[PDB]
Paper text:
Nucleotide excision repair (NER) is an essential pathway to remove bulky lesions affecting one strand of DNA. The XP complementation group G (XPG) endonuclease cleaves the damaged DNA strand on the 3′ side of the lesion coordinated with DNA re-synthesis. Here, we report four crystal structures of the human XPG nuclease domain (XPGn) in the absence and presence of DNA. The overall fold exhibits similarities to other flap endonucleases but XPG harbors a dynamic helical arch that is uniquely oriented and defines a gateway.
For crystallization, we introduced the D812A mutation to abolish the XPG nuclease activity. Two versions of the protein were purified that differ in the presence or absence of extra residues at the N-terminus. Both constructs retain the ability to bind splayed-arm DNA and were used to determine two crystal structures of XPGn in the free state, hereafter F1 and F2, with four and two molecules in the asymmetric unit, respectively. Helices α4 and α6 are fully ordered in two F1 molecules, while the N-terminal half of α6 is disordered in the other two F1 molecules. Comparison of F1 molecules where the arch is fully ordered shows that α6 can adopt two distinct conformations by pivoting on its C-terminal end. In the open state, the α4 and α6 backbones lie ∼14 Å apart and define a gap of ∼11 Å, while in the closed state α6 approaches α4 by about 3 Å. This enables weak interactions at the outer rim of the arch, leading to the formation of a pore above the active site with a diameter of ∼9 Å. Arch closure in the DNA-free state correlates with a striking conformational change in the hydrophobic core of the protein. In the open state, residue W34 in α2 sits in a hydrophobic pocket that is sealed by a cation–π interaction with R61 in α3. In contrast, in the closed state, W34 flips into a looser hydrophobic environment and inserts between α3 and α6, which both shift in opposite directions.
Author numbering: 1 to 41, 50 to 97, 750 to 903, 911 to 987
The structure:
């Protein structure tokens, strides 16, 4: 999700840790990555995965806050419209394609929230981007960080990220921004400029521009904030207009969108819509009896089958 493979660049800034390290931490959990994965495709396997995942969290005495997406921002809605209409090649025919998609994500929102309530796990509906709201819970010190596999959080200014926390590999990667800012020399603004080139949810990139081509462009036009891309654009708009060899001749062959770099994109990552207010989050003891019913209704699980998974979690919670 987000950018094509920003994770590849950050590999070397990631300490591996044991789930046991996360014990006691308040952590934002991004559920929107799960919702999206499950939207494509045994009955209710999405809920089963959520069920297991919740057990892992509570078993390791993590106090998670689930964050669901609010309204999609303008740039996102626009870039999804261009890109879906670039893949194909009536006006109310796609309006029905978005209405069925909106009920399916609508049920899945409700089903997940039910399960969370039952496990005493608090959730919030972010205003805009969950990732951004998770990022601001991070910055306000309301969480000790975010559990997500979406590299986008970094662009919304996340400090602490736990990645691959739900994997068949089962090595939890812990990243802090501070460590990749010092060890790979990669700041927030550089990561944003990379969005502009590699392409993101807020902007399509430049077609033939990979991790390597992109980094070359930022090293070729050193600057602060958006300056590097502004100089790149100026030079390119000037090495187009006037028809004498130079090292980064590769760039002359690239063809960018007219308004690039549109500062609206940087603005959306830098000053996103979020709830800065200090919230009162609570954590309930899981309603064993109501989870048994849920598992009966959704998985067709007898009590015992539910109990097999649930008890180890509960007994594991009743030590400090």
């Amino acid at each position: 999700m987000g950018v094509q493979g920003l994770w590849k660049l950050l590999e070397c800034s990631g300490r591996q840790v044991s789930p046991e390290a996360l014990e006691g931490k308040i952590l934002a959990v991004d559920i929107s990555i799960w919702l999206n994965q499950a939207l494509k495709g045994i009955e209710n396997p999405h809920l089963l995965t959520l069920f297991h995942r919740l057990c892992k969290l509570l078993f390791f005495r993590i106090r998670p806050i689930f964050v669901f997406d609010g309204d999609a921002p303008l740039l996102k809605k626009q870039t999804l419209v261009k890109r879906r209409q670039r893949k194909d090649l009536l006006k109310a025919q796609k309006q029905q394609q978005e209405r069925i998609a909106a009920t399916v994500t609508g049920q899945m929102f409700l089903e997940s929230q039910e399960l969370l309530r039952l496990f005493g796990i608090p959730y919030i509906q972010a205003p805009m981007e969950a990732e951004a709201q998770c990022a601001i819970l991070d910055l306000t010190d309301q969480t000790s960080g975010t559990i997500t596999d979406d590299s986008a959080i970094w662009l919304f200014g996340a400090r602490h990220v736990y990645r691959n926390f739900f994997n068949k590999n089962k090595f939890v990667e812990y990243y802090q921004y501070v460590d990749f800012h010092n060890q790979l020399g990669l700041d927030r603004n550089k990561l944003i400029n990379l969005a502009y080139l590699l392409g993101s949810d807020y902007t399509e990139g430049i077609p033939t521009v990979g991790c390597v081509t992109a980094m070359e462009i930022l090293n070729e036009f050193p600057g602060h904030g958006l300056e590097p891309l502004l100089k790149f654009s100026e030079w390119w708009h000037e090495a187009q207009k006037n028809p004498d060899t130079k090292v980064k001749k590769k760039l002359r062959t690239l063809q960018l969108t007219p308004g690039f770099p549109n500062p609206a994109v940087a603005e959306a990552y830098l000053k996103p819509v979020v709830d800065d207010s200090k919230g009162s989050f609570l954590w309930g003891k899981p309603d064993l009896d109501k989870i048994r019913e849920f598992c009966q209704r959704y998985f067709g699980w007898n009590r015992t089958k539910t109990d097999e998974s649930l008890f180890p979690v509960l007994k594991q919670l009743d030590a400090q």
